[PDB]
Design a protein around this ligand. Structure first.
Ligand code: CLA
Ligand code: CLA
Ligand code: CLA
Ligand code: CLA
Ligand code: CLA
Ligand SMILES: CCCCCC(=O)OC\C(C=C=C1C(C)(C)C[C@H](OC(C)=O)C[C@@]1(C)O)=C/C=C/C(C)=C/C=C/C=C(C)/C=C/C=C(\C)C(=O)C[C@@]12O[C@]1(C)C[C@@H](O)CC2(C)C
Ligand SMILES: CC(=O)O[C@H]1CC(C)(C)C(=C=C/C(C)=C/C=C/C(C)=C/C=C/C=C(C)/C=C/C=C(\C)C(=O)C[C@@]23O[C@]2(C)C[C@@H](O)CC3(C)C)[C@](C)(O)C1
Ligand SMILES: CC(=O)O[C@H]1CC(C)(C)C(=C=C/C(C)=C/C=C/C(C)=C/C=C/C=C(C)/C=C/C=C(\C)C(=O)C[C@@]23O[C@]2(C)C[C@@H](O)CC3(C)C)[C@](C)(O)C1
Ligand code: KC2
Ligand code: KC2
Ligand SMILES: CC1=C(C#C/C(C)=C/C=C/C(C)=C/C=C/C=C(C)/C=C/C=C(C)/C=C/[C@@]23O[C@]2(C)C[C@@H](O)CC3(C)C)C(C)(C)C[C@H](O)C1
Lengths: 179, 134, 194, 210, 236
């Protein structure tokens, strides 16, 4: 655990594992933890950015989510859980199915699997299509991996803050009462 | 028998669901569908299979007549277009698999036939009726 | 597996042969060559089938009459659903379409003497039937590298196209299969010849 | 004959060789790249020549330029007024258009026949042969004046001055092709050539002769 | 041009700030091309953006006041005064005639074609910018050899920077880069003031408002062109 990334100056330049969860972890278990942490970081970053953009009165998509069923993006609600509920069930089904095909492809198509001697939480299938970090130096890439992990953990905290604000009426101090 | 019945089981299960488009005398119950269908269809099928058997076992229709030549192997009627048998490593696997699947298919076809006799409904309809509510 | 030197390993399966059930290990290199040739034929036929299906759905049709004896026209055939068009074609028209396809198949088996199953087969290779594939020499400008890239693109597009034609032909008959709610055209998923 | 890049550089240095379809490197009918390149060059030259001819004819006859001959004795149907040039061709009697096509067919047939071997088989693209000597065609008691230089104003020029004319012919032919298609597109589809002329709204498939 | 050359240019431009490049664009390989190709593309893009904004800032300033031409466009009669009275400069543009817009755009396309043509650039004496050439170069419209000659070139119409010294010309290219950056910010400020009111604090209440999409070259009046009426309706 002491050789992995994620540690920063903000915890003594040291590991943060108060409850010993890394001491019962082999190399494969640590790889699984890192893969789960990174995927949660990715999902939470996308989720919190989308929730903030939607519920902060940001721009919405132009027209009809379903031209036949009659659902405009404006009429969806501009509220996270309500908008997700108002999305058609077919739309949710195909979003989840596309994500599932991507997950199966990720598991079956990234050789040296992350649990068999591969990099945890890397997807060569979905990263830098254009050119962005295919030419960066191996120290700036590590720095940006550390940044990814950091603000991804922050995104986890933020998205669960939004969820708690929605369910618990006013649980977050500086968030509205109708999340 | 194994080859015939492992064709027959697939035919039995898929005749309940699928039909030739607009084929006369279809019935999901294949037992009734035999009588329902035109006799000429079954006559042509039996004629084609008679031609196949005759040409494949020319002068070898009997215990004494067949297997006179030492190279003749049981079941090796020369039917292997895709040439799976040229790979000798998997030949034992495929032979054992043919034998076991043919045996299971003989038993299975007997099961489907007699279950349809018992119930009067096609195979998966009877299966649903078994695995339905009390 | 035996399907290691064979082209077809993609970007979406790592860069390793995708044979989960190990069928390439089954049988002979002749059997694997048959599998490759069947794959490419299904690929090509599926691309043609999806393009024709889009043509039928769009309603674009040739100007004229299919048969002056029966009086059936391209417009009257276009009125039906895409799969019902085949039933609407004249019987002799279907017969001679199948005759042309059968002649092409027979020449592919015959005139390409180093056979796909045989040694040195080149299973995807149907060029040799002169002026059949690429009559305009469009592939002549390319080199070996671009030709390999375009062969891989053929394989990918064709696999996707056969999945697509199965999807569109099974969507309406099997509702809820393809999640996108749109009025897929009616008609049977399978039709007989003649 | 001319290499493709050499010909393209001579025609237009800014463009040079341009062939996204790669038809210059094609093999039509399995006849070989040289033969097929000759075919393509001769097709380009023929299309250009026909386009120049038809463009001068279009500008001439769209301004009601009817010949002084009465043509048809009952009435020249296409010399009537209120007629776009495509409608004039349509209004011509079927025998007239038939005879025109048989004449053009004789010209094409003799073009293909009289060759060194052929424009495909190592022959100069676009070279219309000299009509035969005398009497070697049915009838022809006197001679047939050559379709190229009937009065023999071709020995006037020198070899390089003929190569220059050939390149100018190809470029002008490309421009004339574009011009005729602009005219016809403007006729059928109004405003398709917004910066070109405003022609009458003729509505007929030009690709139907009869 | 290497990153060392980019740094030297940045130092010459702004001695205090210097080379600022938070982006990776100078490091990526654009379209699978090389470092030199990517840097040439970015530098020529910067120079063209600069130049166009420098030209268009003056255009916006003059047309908004009203310095419209005294003559008249389309023969039926809608003078440049009428186009000016249509509104502010974006309103003037989207009120222009369809053919006028298309002629302007396709002349610009012709100039871009000649600018990226190997033959014209080679005749003027320079290579393509992504293939080891000086960014910002526009070839002579004389040496290209149009069948009918052209009197004057685009750059150096009358040779005002004729002779000079190349060290001087590079020093003035530094001026070009800085002025272009400032002009791009200025025109985007003008257009932002036109559309989003109060977006540019200094120019609030000084720039005429606007509602059309500045990123839409053709208007509803130009719906005759294909796929334009639907696109106007589909504007964000
Ligand atoms: C999906 C959740 C998740 C997962 C799988 C991990 C996984 C990891 N984190 Mg952790 N981490 C997370 C979220 C998560 N983190 C969040 C949101 C934060 C912000 C507070 C952090 C902050 C953080 C720091 C600062 C550090 C780590 C580190 C680690 C690594 C070693 C410790 C360990 O074994 O943790 C395993 C963790 C789990 C199996 C999750 C258990 C969840 C419990 C049961 C409930 C949580 C309580 C409440 C609901 C919240 C490991 C890869 C260390 C590292 O990178 O070392 C190299 C490290 O220094 N993490
Ligand atoms: C966890 C991720 C997540 C989820 C579950 C949703 C869910 C939703 N978004 Mg989306 N959205 C996301 C991330 C996400 N968003 C992000 C990162 C952004 C950028 C700010 C947006 C921007 C956005 C807009 C502008 C709108 C929605 C809206 C919607 C709704 C319709 C579906 C849609 O258009 O999705 C689109 C999802 C994406 C483009 C994210 C893909 C992320 C990577 C590439 C995968 C639905 C409630 C609509 C709304 O506001 O309804 C009230 C709408 O118009 N979203
Ligand atoms: C019927 C068409 C068909 C055929 C004949 C083949 C044949 C082949 N594929 Mg496959 N393939 C197909 C469709 C087909 N493919 C489709 C649609 C996809 C998904 C998009 C793939 C994706 C794919 C990949 C990614 C790869 C192959 C490869 C191969 C080769 C090795 C595997 C093998 O022995 O399979 C033999 C299989 C059969 C004889 C077909 C059996 C079909 C069963 C009975 C029914 C399936 C029903 C289905 C579930 C609905 C072989 C040439 C590998 C290759 O090219 O290696 C170089 C490889 O890496 N294929
Ligand atoms: C991305 C596109 C897409 C999506 C989102 C769906 C979605 C769906 N399809 Mg599918 N389908 C697709 C493409 C797609 N299809 C295509 C291209 C075809 C044509 C080949 C089909 C053919 C098809 C059929 C024939 C049927 C469906 C059905 C379904 C449903 C499956 C629900 C389920 O059990 O999930 C699966 C979720 C998983 C997590 C399983 C994946 C992992 C494997 C399979 C587990 C191991 C299996 C092992 C034996 C144990 C759902 C509506 C069914 C339906 O109609 O339901 C209403 C159905 O019968 N589809
Ligand atoms: C190519 C082309 C085609 C398809 C036609 C077709 C036609 N032209 Mg001709 N024409 C052409 C080129 C062509 N022209 C050229 C290059 C010129 C000289 C500039 C003319 C000048 C011309 C005139 C002045 C007239 C025609 C007319 C005609 C018609 C009868 C044929 C004739 O008189 O031939 C012309 C043969 C020539 C050698 C000239 C017909 C519609 C007649 C008409 O208007 O009928 C409707 C007519 O009076 N054409
Ligand atoms: C935008 C497209 C531009 C490309 C196309 C183009 O420009 O089209 C232009 C175009 C039409 C048009 C348009 C306009 C309306 C005018 C303008 C608009 O333009 C815009 C908007 O931009 C639209 C456009 C282009 O549509 C048409 C062009 C037609 C063309 C080019 C027609 C050539 C006939 C030559 C003949 C008959 C010569 C016989 C010559 C003969 C018989 C000889 O004696 C040969 C000779 O060798 C001999 C034997 C001996 C030698 O001693 C030398 C000579 C020479 C004596
Ligand atoms: C997710 C969901 O719910 O739904 C999704 C998924 C689902 C259900 C699967 C769906 C579907 C159907 C799909 C995706 C169908 C895909 C069909 C596909 C992919 C069809 C390819 C045809 C290619 C042809 C005909 C190419 C010929 C090309 C030829 C003959 C060439 O000459 C090529 C050429 O290179 C040469 C050789 C030489 C060059 O010199 C010139 C060019 C370049 C021209 C949906 C409903 O649509 C959407
Ligand atoms: C909002 C707030 O609170 O604050 C601010 C922010 C905000 C909005 C950004 C503002 C703004 C706008 C700004 C700053 C706009 C900047 C505009 C800028 C900087 C525009 C340059 C054009 C240069 C040209 C056209 C030169 C051509 C020159 C050429 C082609 C020559 O002839 C020169 C020449 O020497 C050569 C090269 C060769 C020599 O032989 C001689 C000659 C003469 C031939 C405001 C208004 O400040 C308010
Ligand atoms: C990332 C996920 C994703 C992908 C990759 C993806 C791809 C494709 C492709 C190409 C491969 C096609 C051809 C296609 C077509 C349609 N999509 Mg789909 N789509 C995704 C997501 C959603 C969502 C969220 C919705 C949706 C819908 C529709 C409708 C319905 C129109 C209507 O009924 O008016 C049609 C025709 C909406 C829906 O079904 O609403 C009931 C809807 O809400 N899609 N979609
Ligand atoms: C593989 C493609 C193909 C080829 C290469 C091909 C070649 C030739 C040749 C030259 C060798 C001749 C001389 C010829 C003649 C006729 N073809 Mg034919 N044909 C092809 C396809 C179809 C289809 C799809 C149809 C069709 C038909 C007719 C009829 C109408 C008869 C009528 O009035 O009934 C006549 C006279 C229609 C038909 O059979 O209608 C019952 C019809 O639908 N063909 N066809
Ligand atoms: C060994 C082997 C293999 C095997 C095997 C397997 C799986 C074999 C399985 C055989 C199996 C499964 C054999 C069932 C027989 C059932 C019978 C006879 C039922 C009679 C039922 C009767 C007579 C019912 C009568 C009644 O209903 C009537 C008519 C009316 C009611 O009033 C009264 C009752 C209910 C009594 C492999 C693996 C395939 C290959 C390998 O190489 C070799």
């Amino acid at each position: 655990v002491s050789d992995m990334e994620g540690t920063g100056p903000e915890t003594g330049g040291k590991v943060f594992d108060p409850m010993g969860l890394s001491k019962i972890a082999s190399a494969e278990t640590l790889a699984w933890y890192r893969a789960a942490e990174l995927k949660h970081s990715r999902v939470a970053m996308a989720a919190v950015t989308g929730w903030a953009w939607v519920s902060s009165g940001g721009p919405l998509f132009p027209g009809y989510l379903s031209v036949e069923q009659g659902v405009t993006f404006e009429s969806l609600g501009r509220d996270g859980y309500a908008a997700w509920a108002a999305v058609p069930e077919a739309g949710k089904f195909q979003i989840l199915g596309v994500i599932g095909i991507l997950e199966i492809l990720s598991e079956s198509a990234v050789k040296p699997h992350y649990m068999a001697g591969g990099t945890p939480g890397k997807v060569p299938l979905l990263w830098d299509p254009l050119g962005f970090t295919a030419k960066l130096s191996p120290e700036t890439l590590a720095r940006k991996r550390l940044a990814e992990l950091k603000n991804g953990r922050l995104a986890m905290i933020g998205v669960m803050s939004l969820v708690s604000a929605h369910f618990i009426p006013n649980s977050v101090p500086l968030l509205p009462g109708s999340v | 028998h194994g080859r015939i019945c492992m064709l027959a089981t697939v035919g039995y299960i898929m005749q309940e669901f699928f039909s030739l488009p607009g084929y006369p005398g279809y019935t999901p119950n294949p037992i009734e569908a035999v009588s329902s269908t035109p006799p000429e269809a079954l006559a042509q099928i039996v004629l084609v299979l008679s031609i196949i058997e005759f040409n494949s076992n020319k002068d070898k229709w009997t215990m004494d007549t067949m297997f006179t030549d030492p190279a003749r192997e049981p079941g090796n009627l020369g039917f292997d277009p895709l040439k799976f048998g040229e790979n000798k490593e998997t030949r034992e696997r495929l032979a054992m698999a043919e034998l076991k699947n043919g045996r299971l298919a003989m038993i299975a076809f007997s099961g489907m036939i007699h279950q349809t006799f018992v119930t009067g409904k096609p195979l998966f309809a009877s299966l649903n009726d078994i695995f339905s509510s009390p | 597996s035996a399907a290691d030197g064979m082209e077809g390993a993609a970007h979406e399966t790592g860069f390793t042969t995708w044979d989960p059930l190990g069928l390439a290990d089954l049988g002979s290199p002749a059997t694997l060559a048959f599998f490759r040739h069947a794959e490419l034929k299904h690929c090509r036929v599926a691309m043609a089938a999806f393009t024709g299906w889009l043509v039928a759905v769009s309603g674009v049709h040739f100007p004229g009459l299919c048969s002056f004896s029966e009086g059936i026209s391209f417009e009257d055939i276009s009125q039906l659903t895409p799969m019902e068009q085949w039933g609407a074609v004249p019987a002799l028209g279907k017969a001679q379409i199948l005759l042309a396809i059968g002649i092409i198949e027979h020449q592919s088996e015959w005139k390409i003497k180093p056979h796909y199953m045989a040694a040195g087969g080149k299973p995807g290779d149907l060029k040799g039937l002169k002026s059949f594939w690429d009559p305009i020499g469009l592939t002549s400008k390319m080199d070996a590298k671009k030709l390999e890239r375009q062969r891989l693109s053929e394989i990918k597009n064709g696999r996707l196209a056969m999945i697509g034609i199965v999807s569109v032909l099974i969507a309406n008959n099997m509702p809820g299969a393809i999640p996108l709610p749109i009025a897929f055209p009616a008609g049977p998923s399978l039709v007989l010849p003649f | 004959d001319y290499s493709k890049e050499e010909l393209a550089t001579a025609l237009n240095p800014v463009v040079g060789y341009f062939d996204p379809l790669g038809l210059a490197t094609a093999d039509f009918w399995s006849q070989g790249n040289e033969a097929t390149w000759g075919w393509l060059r001769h097709a380009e030259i023929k299309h250009g020549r026909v386009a120049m001819f038809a463009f001068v004819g279009y500008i001439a006859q769209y301004n009601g330029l009817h010949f002084g001959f009465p043509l048809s004795l009952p009435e020249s149907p296409s010399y009537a007024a209120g007629l776009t040039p495509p409608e004039q061709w349509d209004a011509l009697p079927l025998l007239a258009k038939a005879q025109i096509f048989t004449f053009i067919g004789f010209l094409e047939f003799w073009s293909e026949l009289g060759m060194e071997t052929h424009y495909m088989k190592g022959g100069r693209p676009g070279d219309y042969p000299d009509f035969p000597k005398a009497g070697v065609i049915p009838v022809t008691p006197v001679k047939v004046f050559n379709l190229y230089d009937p009065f023999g104003f071709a020995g006037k020029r020198s070899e390089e001055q003929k190569a220059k004319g050939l390149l100018a012919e190809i470029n002008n032919g490309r421009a004339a092709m574009i011009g005729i298609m602009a005219f016809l597109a403007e006729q059928k589809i109004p405003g398709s050539v917004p910066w070109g002329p405003h022609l009458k709204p003729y509505a007929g498939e030009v690709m139907a002769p009869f | 041009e290497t990153i060392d050359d980019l740094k030297s240019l940045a130092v010459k431009a702004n001695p205090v700030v210097g080379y600022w490049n938070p982006t990776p664009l100078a490091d990526m390989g654009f379209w699978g091309q090389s470092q030199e190709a990517t840097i040439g593309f970015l530098r020529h893009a910067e120079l063209k953006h600069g130049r166009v904004a420098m030209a268009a800032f003056v255009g916006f300033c003059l047309q908004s006041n009203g310095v419209h031409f005294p003559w008249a466009c389309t023969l039926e009669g809608t003078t440049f005064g009428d186009i000016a009275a249509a509104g502010g400069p974006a309103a003037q543009w989207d009120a222009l005639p369809t053919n006028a817009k298309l002629q302007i755009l396709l002349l610009i396309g012709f100039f871009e074609l000649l600018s990226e043509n190997t033959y014209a650039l080679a005749q003027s004496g320079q290579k393509h910018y992504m293939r080891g050439g000086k960014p910002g170069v526009f070839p002579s419209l004389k040496k290209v050899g149009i069948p009918v000659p052209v009197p004057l070139d685009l750059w150096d119409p009358f040779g005002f920077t004729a002779k000079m010294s190349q060290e001087k010309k590079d020093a003035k290219l530094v001026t070009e880069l800085n002025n272009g950056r400032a002009a791009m910010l200025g025109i985007m400020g003008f257009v932002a003031a036109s559309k989003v009111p109060g977006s540019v604090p200094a120019l609030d209440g000084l720039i005429a408002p606007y509602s059309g999409e500045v990123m839409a070259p053709f208007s509803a009046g130009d719906s005759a062109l294909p796929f334009v009426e639907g696109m106007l309706k589909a504007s964000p």
